[PDB]
Design a protein around this nucleic acid. Sequence first.
DNA 1: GCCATGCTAGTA
DNA 2: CTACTAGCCATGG
Length: 108
Amino acid sequence: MRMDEFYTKVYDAVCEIPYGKVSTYGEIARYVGMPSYARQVGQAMKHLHPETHVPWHRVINSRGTISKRDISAGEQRQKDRLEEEGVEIYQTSLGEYKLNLPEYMWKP
DNA sequence: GCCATGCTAGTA
DNA sequence: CTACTAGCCATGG
């Protein structure tokens, strides 16, 4: 399966995530038949263009947190986008932004 | 070819 | 709950 196919598949999936809901790299990976490629779902996201109709903000990690960026602290920009969709987000004891995954996670 | 970068399940 | 590890895998130098 071509990388550009994957990349397409992924975006297709993300866009299916309803307003106010969320998903995760892994789940998306599995959704589109590429279970081991969670990191690459990362990649996909990171490669979109800032002015995109894609709900990249609806995608977080397995642990229900928002993931630190080795480049570009717009993880802030991700929290904000969620709070508008109405999403209780708590900084963990450390400065991590967490949320009640079971409550928010989405499934077709 | 190697080696650094940039999610997750499992174990302690 | 927090660590820390093993394994994963495209991408670019």
